[PDB]
Amino acid sequence: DKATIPSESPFAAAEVADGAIVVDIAKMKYETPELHVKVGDTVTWINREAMPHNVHFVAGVLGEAALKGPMMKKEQAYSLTFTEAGTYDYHCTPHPFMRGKVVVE
Ligand SMILES: [Cu+2]
């Protein structure tokens, strides 16, 4: 896997690690649809709206199988730590029109 997952379950926005690299989700969009980070960084998505959202990576992207993240409720978060350079596209399972990518340098 080209990513590790600190927590399988979503957690509270207030529980996000200091100096976290945050991508907010609001208005049915990932606020930073093109995020650039370095190898070893942890990316955290935070849902700021009542409609649940997730991040879903298709099979072959971060590993052999698809990585379908859990649904985040309002003010819930979810992290992924990227261990290899590359460009990783993702989308929201229930709302596939919501798309983003993280470019690991
Ligand atoms: Cu969504």
d(CA 9, CA 95): 20
d(CA 84, CA 69): 19
Total Cβ atoms within 10 A of residue 11: 16
Solved with: X-ray
Q: 1 C-alpha to center of ligand 1: Å? A: 24
Q: 98 C-alpha to center of ligand 1: Å? A: 6
Question: How many Å separate Cα 40 from the centre of its chain?
Answer: 15
| Phi-psi group of 86: left, alpha or beta (phi > 0 → left; psi -120 to 50 → alpha; rest → beta) | left
Q: 49 C-alpha to center of ligand 1: Å? A: 10
Residue 98 marked ligand-binding: yes
- Residues in Cβ contact with 53 at an 8 Å cutoff, skipping those fewer than 6 apart: 25, 45, 47, 71, 72, 92, 94, 95, 98
- Radius of gyration over every alpha carbon of the chain, rounded to an integer in angstroms: 12
d(CA 26, CA 13): 14
**Residue 76 corresponds to which tokens in the numbers above?**
């819930």
Residue 36 marked ligand-binding: no
d(CA 82, CA 3): 4
List domains and CATH numbers for the chain. 1-105 (2.60.40.420)
Listed resolution, Å: 1.8
Within a 13 Å sphere around the CA of 20, how many CA atoms are in the beta-carbon half?
Answer: 19
